[PDB]
Amino acid sequence: IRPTIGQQMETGDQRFGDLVFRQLAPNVWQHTSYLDMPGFGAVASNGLIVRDGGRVLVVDTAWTDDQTAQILNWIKQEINLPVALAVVTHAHQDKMGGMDALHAAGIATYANALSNQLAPQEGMVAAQHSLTFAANGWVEPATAPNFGPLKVFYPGPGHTSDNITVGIDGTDIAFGGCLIKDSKAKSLGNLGDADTEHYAASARAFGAAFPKASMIVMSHSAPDSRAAITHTARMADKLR
Amino acid sequence: IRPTIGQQMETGDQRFGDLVFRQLAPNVWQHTSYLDMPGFGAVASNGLIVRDGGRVLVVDTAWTDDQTAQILNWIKQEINLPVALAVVTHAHQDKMGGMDALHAAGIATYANALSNQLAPQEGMVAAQHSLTFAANGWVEPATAPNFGPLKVFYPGPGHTSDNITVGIDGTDIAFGGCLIKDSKAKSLGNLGDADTEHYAASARAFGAAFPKASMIVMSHSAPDSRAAITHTARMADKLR
Ligand SMILES: CC1(C)S[C@H]([C@H](NC(=O)[C@H](N)c2ccc(O)cc2)C(=O)O)N[C@H]1C(=O)O
Ligand SMILES: CC1(C)S[C@H]([C@H](NC(=O)[C@H](N)c2ccc(O)cc2)C(=O)O)N[C@H]1C(=O)O
Ligand SMILES: [Zn+2]
Ligand SMILES: [Zn+2]
Ligand SMILES: [Zn+2]
Ligand SMILES: [Zn+2]
Ligand SMILES: [Zn+2]
């Protein structure tokens, strides 16, 4: 409802069960789910839903299996196309807590190989398939077959060592997950698993990988301008 | 000759210019090079040389180009066979400081894709080829072509997020690089770039990957028993 961390609801948001959905482009929506921590309040987390070529592609789970099943039910009601695959952007609960729900639904799942290696240690179910990356950060194409417009980029260690990012070709949208914070953020969030030496370069690498995108989507704020990238990088410069 | 950090010279060590070489098995030698730190003395770093029939394989550079050129000169004098390739075990100076000497010699160089992505940020030159890894840490074989007895394993983040390890097939030797400290060590060394949460599991994963290796080679101590692995993991348990 009214998160302690994460954006508030605004015009253009559709409530569906315990989740919120917002259309960002003709074929792209943002999903938002909430983890209610007793004595603290709710923490919102955002991911994406993309319609491409008669199928739906999901970026990130919700915090829980039940919330992720609700995402799939929203897709069934609003889009009514098969969900071909999901990409999850690192091995933490806000991005991978709902993997079992995707697997039960027959959806193929993909994550950075390192995310799958870390997953059990982080309390997560690993994805079924591992993405690997060139030294320049771009996904190795044979590991990401039939990805439609999704352009998957590993920017380097930052929020975690395994964090990946996703652009949507043909749109104005790029997704930074938990790496990118908004242009008005006062902190970089949870740095407990973070690489404070390399964070700034990784944020800048994300910006340079998706130079055209004007709508920067992220895990814990509303979509922002490219100022979110510059601000995240400058905040991260202070950690070195 | 007498490092402040690293093993001292014992019987069976051959001094060659500024470096020290020790035969570990009929076809395996340890190379040792020294970085003199002003007011502190020398820090030794160890890598390996492996003969595989009519060719030689190298694990890790020395600290500098000139020291690495001396490794190549020792190989020429003592073995007199071509170096087919080198594998470097993460993007820090002790393991990658001499890349330029390998390249000048025409030696094909390999590192974790992440090491190559970090190298420019660490003041290193990237290797010319990238290794990638499965979700259980084993190298993808197509990325390690014609590696002979070198069995490359990524154990998870520990000393750094990119650290890799190498078993020598057909021997009882496995190389832990800077991840593993000796059985008598009191500290884990430089933890500035370390993953303190995952270190213990990564050290144990290295041991489980090479369960019959009885001689554990590491960057800054003489070859040790498997107690190097178990003691490293025990110290790392304390970081969590
Ligand atoms: C919004 C954050 C500060 S929390 C989240 C994440 N942690 C969890 O998913 C944990 N499971 C968790 C545990 C307790 C709790 O109350 C809430 C979350 C992380 O550690 O990165 N991402 C962060 C970020 O993007 O900065
Ligand atoms: C033996 C260590 C403690 S230093 C080495 C490495 N650092 C360097 O290569 C740096 N270039 C460097 C900078 C200043 C200096 O005085 C010496 C070395 C690292 O940071 O991991 N590996 C460590 C380890 O294995 O624990
Ligand atoms: Zn996270
Ligand atoms: Zn987050
Ligand atoms: Zn963690
Ligand atoms: Zn190091
Ligand atoms: Zn070292």
UniProtKB/Swiss-Prot annotation, chains A, B:
Catalytic reaction equation(s): a beta-lactam + H2O = a substituted beta-amino acid
The keyword Ubl conjugation appears for this protein: no
Record text on subunit structure and interactions: Monomer.
Residues annotated as binding Zn(2+) 1: H90, H92, H159
Species of provenance: Klebsiella pneumoniae
Gene Ontology cellular-component terms listed: periplasmic space
Cofactor: Zn(2+)
GO process terms (BP): antibiotic catabolic process; response to antibiotic
Documented EC number(s): 3.5.2.6
Protein name: Metallo-beta-lactamase type 2
Residues where Zn(2+) 2 binds: D94, C178, H220
Additional detail: Enterobacteriaceae carrying this gene (identified by PCR) have been isolated in Sweden, India, Pakistan, Bangladesh, England, Scotland, Northern Ireland, Australia and the USA. The organisms they were identified in were K.pneumoniae, Enterobacter cloacae, E.coli, Proteus spp, Citrobacter freundii, Morganella morganii, Providencia spp and Klebsille oxytoca. In India most isolates were from community-acquired infections rather than hospital-acquired infections, indicating the gene is widespread in the environment.
Purpose of the protein: Confers resistance to the different beta-lactams antibiotics (penicillin, cephalosporin and carbapenem) via the hydrolysis of the beta-lactam ring. Does not confer resistance to the polymixin colistin or the fluoroquinolone ciprofloxacin.
A GO MF label: beta-lactamase activity
PANTHER family listed in its UniProt record: ACYL-COENZYME A THIOESTERASE MBLAC2, METALLO-BETA-LACTAMASE DOMAIN-CONTAINING
Protein family: Belongs to the metallo-beta-lactamase superfamily. Class-B beta-lactamase family.
InterPro entries on file: Metallo-B-lactamas, NDM-1-like, RibonucZ/Hydroxyglut_hydro
Cofactor notes: Binds 2 Zn(2+) ions per subunit.
Regulation: Inhibits by captopril, thiorphan, dimercaprol and tiopronin. This enzyme is not susceptible to inactivation by the beta-lactamase-blocking agents clavulanic acid.
